[PDB]
Amino acid sequence: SGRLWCKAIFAGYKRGLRNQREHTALLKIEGVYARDETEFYLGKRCAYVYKAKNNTVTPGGKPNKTRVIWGKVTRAHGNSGMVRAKFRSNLPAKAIGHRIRVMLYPSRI
Amino acid sequence: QVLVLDGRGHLLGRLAAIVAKQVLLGRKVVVVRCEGINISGNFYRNKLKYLAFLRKRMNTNPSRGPYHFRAPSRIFWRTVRGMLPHKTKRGQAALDRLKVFDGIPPPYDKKKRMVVPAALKVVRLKPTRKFAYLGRLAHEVGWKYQAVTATLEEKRKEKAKIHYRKKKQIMRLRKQAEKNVEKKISKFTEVLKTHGLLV
Amino acid sequence: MKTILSNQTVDIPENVDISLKGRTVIVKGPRGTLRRDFNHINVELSLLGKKKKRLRVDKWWGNRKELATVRTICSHVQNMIKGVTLGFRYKMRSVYAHFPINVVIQENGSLVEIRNFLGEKYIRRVRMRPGVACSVSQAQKDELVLEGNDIELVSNSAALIQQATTVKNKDIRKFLDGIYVSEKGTVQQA
Amino acid sequence: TKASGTLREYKVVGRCLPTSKSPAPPLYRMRIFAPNHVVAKSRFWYFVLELKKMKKSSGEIVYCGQVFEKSPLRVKNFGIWLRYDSRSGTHNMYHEYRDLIMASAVTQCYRDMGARHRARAHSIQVMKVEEMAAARCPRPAVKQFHDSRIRFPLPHRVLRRQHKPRFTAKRPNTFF
Amino acid sequence: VFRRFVEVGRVAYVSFGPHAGKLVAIVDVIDQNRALDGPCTRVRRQAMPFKCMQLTDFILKFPHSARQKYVRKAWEKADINTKWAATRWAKKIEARERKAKMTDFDRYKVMKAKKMRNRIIKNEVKKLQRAALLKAS
Amino acid sequence: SHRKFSAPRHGSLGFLPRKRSSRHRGKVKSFPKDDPSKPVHLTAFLGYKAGMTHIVREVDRPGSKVNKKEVVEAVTIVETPPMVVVGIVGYVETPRGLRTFKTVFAEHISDECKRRFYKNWHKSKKKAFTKYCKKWQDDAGKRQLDKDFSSMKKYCQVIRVLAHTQMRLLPLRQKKAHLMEIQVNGGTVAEKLDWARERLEQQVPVSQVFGQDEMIDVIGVTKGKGYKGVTSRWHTKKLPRKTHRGLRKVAC
RNA sequence: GCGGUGCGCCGCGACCGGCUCCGGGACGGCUGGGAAGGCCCGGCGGGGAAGGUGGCCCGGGGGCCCCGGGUGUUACAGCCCA
RNA sequence: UGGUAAGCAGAACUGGCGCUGCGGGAUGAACCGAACGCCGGGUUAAGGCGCCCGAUGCCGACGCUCAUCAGACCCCAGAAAA
RNA sequence: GCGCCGGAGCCUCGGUUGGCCUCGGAUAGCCGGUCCCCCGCCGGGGUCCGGUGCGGAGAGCCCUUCGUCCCGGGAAACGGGGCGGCCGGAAAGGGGGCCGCCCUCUCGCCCGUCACGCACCGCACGUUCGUGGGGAACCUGGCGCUAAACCAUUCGUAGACGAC
């Protein structure tokens, strides 16, 4: 009936000032604003939900237009609740400042 | 989903530095009452700083040159514009989300306006330092519609005062009808206070 | 150093009843109510004792630029106390060499014309500040009188007629002529 | 030296590895205010060399222990005699501080000699730190705290924790 | 205009730091922005800055250099630990900690109460608005 | 190196987009500032330059060497047939500038005023204001037209009156009249709007705007002279005949 | 059934091992055999001064109720030391 | 060493650039860090951590400073006597 | 063959996964409550009481929904759903509030009894905003529209040519 994932923002890639490393993404999870509070979300699965033109098969039932690139919150970033997530396919940078879902279900509570 | 930030008392670059970053994270921001924004240091320094900005024009065709936007909304827009990569297609995707206003145009005059406390003159300046209202700056450097805005601004300062008077009037009825009904919500008040809502 | 505390008491009399609206001190008495706002100055204003016989201005953790903003507030309120009881009368006199300066008084106190200054055809309308009354005393030669409550507005309105009469493109050591502030006093006495 | 963190006061004694003339040279003690024991023994040789014909190689460090606080809960006046290198010549200064701890007051001195005069810990030479009677302290900056019934509010409470909402409804107060 | 003052014996409430949530008594003022003990609330005699302590309306009468034996006396004599707890500040401090420990089932048991406790007051406030309407017309 | 001998700059930069006027009928760029201590009046008119002739008059001024001697001064004739008011327009005051609120045209509009709404009058079926005019001959239409004044004397601040030139009373080739918004400056906004609505479908002569011996502003488009060169346009120095490619151009 | 090899594409859990950044436990060594402090009653005896507690005044805060100054080693608080 | 000096001319010692990417100093042959097969994980240097721009969104510590020409990072890019 | 009002499939743009309908504003001060009282046409004054690390809290509020049913208790009758008007707003106007009523029920909401719904056999983009945004169209109905621009010609207030 309700939402079973937390709001994250694909803010950027793991980048220096003049070099970006696309294989590691930076996830701004809404709610957590320090490394104090980042402890829960480490090792959690995080999905980039997008929809395209051509239909693709879905695990559960009928083929939708909606797709994902799956991920995994690797470890905490910076000092302000930013987190590093490493995706199985390196995210497209059209998704910069768009909604990707930090899930709950590599649960350890 | 939309930030409706108030501009009254906020600092020029401090609010810009926090707006510009939120908008890059795909948060639609509305900064309102930008005449209320003030800039640190005395007025005459900030006057000279913008007069120094006016003097900088493309010598061979000023119409091509730097567009010195004189409205406080567009002095706030341009200071945010400097804190965005406005050449790239992610940084122009940003500015399209930002929506800046002189006064409080509807539909934003009947929405609760948020405050950035990390960009506020009471929080960030000393009470013995000096500041410069963007209303006085813009007007004296060539903004026309301050005395237009300030009279439309004085309409809703009467209209919203009636709304608040009409809302205190309904909260007095709640501080009467929480009390008449105190005996038959007694089960429903305790469990709120065991888990710490009305304590 | 940051001086931990600096205070000075203004002993407000029985005839003058002052109050404070945050830090906007209002001063009423025999000849009008004077208000002045101190939003800028950043001090504690305490009105203590029954019948409120002393105002007390403090300054917690004040440096040298901010300790000098205590006795100014003392003297501001003390001038406010003076002007509310005794008033401010600035008797200013007309100095000339040859041409007698004709000063006629217009618009029930406010506007003051100055004819024939250094033999000039140009009449000079000087309006006084709102709440300052100008008069010319008789059986005299050369005398103006201002009358008011706020010292800020009486001298400001006197400075308007002292700088109305400046001698342009000359040696002002020889051409001494002009309307200058001769005497600083009050209307009625203690 | 680098006046890093809070300085620890070390007692460093030492003497000359023996001559045929003097079989046992005199033991020389010093109050060294150092971040750690390693640089305390380095700063020991600096001053002793300035005073005697006692270098590091023609000498030995005998004891190196931190002289701790004998009253770290009592508020005390401290009078530090300085010798700092300005951009033109050196100057003898007498400065006064107010701390529980001697080493903390010399830490509080190193920041202050940097703050007001832009002198670094290499320029500065702390020659004497003497705990002072409350009536023997000249500066009014430290004297002003010598009132039995001292009483001040915290007038303009500039709130920190500014980025905990980052976006709020209420304008924050400062008359707490 | 000020009510609370940094005076020897004032109970101040430690907001942040390692002693966040404990009461402390101001024994002596060291500096402009640094003070010097809360013997009954498990706070050792220590130097601590003014920034971290939110100073209350409790002064308990003992001298500035007095050792921790004579802080504990004037503390318990004034009876601060029970005088604190009954104040509406201390109550909403330990209402904040209850709402923190609100279990997902406790979140349910309050929500079902929230609804029925507010489903009545929308009815009852509306009936009060006829008491404003009956007098007019 | 520097300018050897100083000269004032040829022409002004205070108009320098020297292009074809974007409007043939000269727009009033700004109307006079008003104070409601005056009566209601039209602030402008719309005339046609007929020609140019002499005068003889006795100069009434102290001091001059031509004190009550006869001056032959040049005068223009502007044929000003009395304009007909066919509408009113409200302008609300916005912080983005000044926005038009609502245009309310009159019941009947003359065929000369109709022509201005068209390009090809001959080819058209002339159907303009056939369904707008119907809001005047039914009581259902009237109340909205009255509510368009009820919701204009309240909201709007600047009120201008739509007038047109009566092209019938001119010796010109053309018939297509010239519309113009004349700002009604004078008393309060309700008094101003209860005035112009009474003046709707009515004649406005020139005596009821302009009085004699009055200084006024003439807003007219300059006479077109086509693609003229820099010595013809900017009035620079001609080069001294020995020049190769031309002597009627700017050197540097 | 027992070994070997592998899944059509898409996924997933598991324990072991390598290397990792952490987090919480718990034990101990040394020191001026830590310095301080806590609790035992400020163990008996002075003496010292002060950022002077009590007692006496001065002006003012009241229908006699408390702060500012001055006194001085004790007093209905405390501080340091011999 | 010559020359008032020079991004000038001429030596010594080493290290560079040339022949060489790389991280930083916005930019730059030489400066600072560090020299390179192709990659994933981790950690650093020199430098930074309002925003562009990864990183202080620490409830960082104590002072200093008002500029009607503010100040702001080796080489390095605006000043003296007074 | 088009405009407003009232079936079923296909194309294609993707982002989103409960909303907060508002005092003004102060900062060495504020917030909310009221008799003696001056005005303004019920407010705004002085007064007095409470809140003040803001609990009439954005550290927040409201709303939170597996569903259905029978049997009882709290709770609602001043309510619940859907028509005609009643009436509120121009700065970038709004979809609200309130009443009469044709009107349908004592269901919603809080406990507890009692029962069942592909119980899809440990597993993914589920869950909404969404009768979304634009794009050709198809059935089937009502109520209403019949224009203009450009060229060509002409002018000469215009003009290199266009434009005007």
Short mmCIF file of C-alpha atoms in Angstrom, two decimals, chain C residues 8-123:
data_model
loop_
_atom_site.label_atom_id
_atom_site.label_comp_id
_atom_site.label_asym_id
_atom_site.label_seq_id
_atom_site.Cartn_x
_atom_site.Cartn_y
_atom_site.Cartn_z
CA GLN C 8 25.51 55.16 33.44
CA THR C 9 22.21 56.24 35.16
CA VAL C 10 19.96 59.09 33.80
CA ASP C 11 17.98 60.33 36.89
CA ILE C 12 14.61 61.18 35.17
CA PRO C 13 12.69 63.79 37.27
CA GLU C 14 9.10 63.74 38.76
CA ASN C 15 7.81 66.29 36.13
CA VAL C 16 9.04 64.02 33.22
CA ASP C 17 7.51 60.46 33.10
CA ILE C 18 9.56 58.34 30.59
CA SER C 19 8.89 54.70 29.50
CA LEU C 20 10.52 52.22 27.01
CA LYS C 21 8.94 50.08 24.20
CA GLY C 22 11.78 47.52 23.86
CA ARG C 23 14.47 50.22 23.32
CA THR C 24 12.23 53.04 21.84
CA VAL C 25 12.30 55.47 24.86
CA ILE C 26 9.29 57.91 24.87
CA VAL C 27 9.68 61.07 27.09
CA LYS C 28 6.51 63.13 27.98
CA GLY C 29 6.28 66.23 30.24
CA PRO C 30 5.22 69.94 30.44
CA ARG C 31 5.70 70.91 26.69
CA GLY C 32 5.22 67.74 24.54
CA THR C 33 6.12 64.01 24.14
CA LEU C 34 9.55 63.23 22.50
CA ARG C 35 10.13 59.69 21.03
CA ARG C 36 13.54 58.36 19.77
CA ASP C 37 14.34 54.80 18.47
CA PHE C 38 17.70 53.07 19.35
CA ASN C 39 17.30 49.91 17.12
CA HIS C 40 20.95 50.40 15.90
CA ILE C 41 22.80 50.89 19.24
CA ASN C 42 22.45 47.41 20.95
CA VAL C 43 22.14 48.15 24.76
CA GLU C 44 19.96 47.01 27.75
CA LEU C 45 17.61 49.89 28.88
CA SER C 46 16.39 49.40 32.53
CA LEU C 47 13.75 51.71 34.19
CA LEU C 48 14.00 50.86 37.95
CA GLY C 49 12.66 52.24 41.29
CA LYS C 50 8.93 53.01 41.98
CA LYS C 51 7.89 56.29 40.21
CA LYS C 52 10.79 55.27 37.84
CA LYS C 53 13.20 58.05 39.07
CA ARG C 54 16.28 56.66 37.14
CA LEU C 55 16.80 55.19 33.62
CA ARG C 56 19.83 52.77 33.57
CA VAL C 57 21.60 51.95 30.21
CA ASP C 58 23.98 48.88 30.35
CA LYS C 59 26.45 47.37 27.80
CA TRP C 60 27.55 43.69 28.38
CA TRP C 61 30.91 42.76 26.68
CA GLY C 62 31.53 46.12 24.88
CA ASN C 63 34.79 47.02 23.03
CA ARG C 64 36.03 50.68 22.79
CA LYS C 65 33.89 51.55 19.66
CA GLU C 66 30.81 50.15 21.60
CA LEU C 67 31.54 51.57 25.16
CA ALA C 68 31.35 55.09 23.54
CA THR C 69 27.69 54.12 22.65
CA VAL C 70 26.58 54.44 26.37
CA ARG C 71 27.18 58.12 27.46
CA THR C 72 25.77 59.27 24.03
CA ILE C 73 22.45 57.47 24.98
CA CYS C 74 22.80 59.10 28.49
CA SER C 75 23.20 62.62 26.91
CA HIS C 76 20.52 61.88 24.19
CA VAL C 77 17.89 61.10 26.94
CA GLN C 78 19.24 63.99 29.16
CA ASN C 79 18.73 66.44 26.19
CA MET C 80 15.30 64.69 25.68
CA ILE C 81 14.52 65.40 29.43
CA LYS C 82 15.69 69.08 29.02
CA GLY C 83 13.66 69.81 25.81
CA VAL C 84 10.46 68.15 27.25
CA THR C 85 10.55 70.43 30.41
CA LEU C 86 12.66 73.52 29.51
CA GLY C 87 12.64 73.42 25.63
CA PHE C 88 15.48 74.49 23.25
CA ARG C 89 15.83 78.24 22.39
CA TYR C 90 18.80 78.97 20.00
CA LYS C 91 19.05 82.81 19.81
CA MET C 92 21.05 83.41 16.55
CA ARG C 93 22.11 86.93 15.39
CA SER C 94 22.47 88.68 11.96
CA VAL C 95 26.07 89.98 11.29
CA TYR C 96 26.51 92.48 8.35
CA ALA C 97 28.99 95.23 7.21
CA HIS C 98 26.98 97.54 4.81
CA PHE C 99 23.71 95.85 3.59
CA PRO C 100 21.15 95.27 6.42
CA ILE C 101 19.90 91.60 6.21
CA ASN C 102 16.03 91.70 6.08
CA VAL C 103 14.70 88.43 7.71
CA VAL C 104 10.83 88.27 7.54
CA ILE C 105 9.09 85.25 9.23
CA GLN C 106 6.49 83.32 7.09
CA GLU C 107 4.05 80.33 7.35
CA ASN C 108 3.16 80.50 11.14
CA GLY C 109 6.77 79.76 12.32
CA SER C 110 8.34 77.40 9.70
CA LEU C 111 9.43 79.33 6.52
CA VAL C 112 12.08 82.15 6.93
CA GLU C 113 12.94 84.56 4.02
CA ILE C 114 16.44 86.24 3.92
CA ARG C 115 16.46 89.41 1.67
CA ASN C 116 19.38 91.76 0.78
CA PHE C 117 22.29 89.50 2.01
CA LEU C 118 25.52 91.18 0.63
CA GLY C 119 23.24 93.31 -1.66
CA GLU C 120 21.76 90.19 -3.42
CA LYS C 121 18.29 90.21 -5.15
CA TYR C 122 17.95 86.42 -4.37
CA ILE C 123 15.42 85.74 -1.53
#
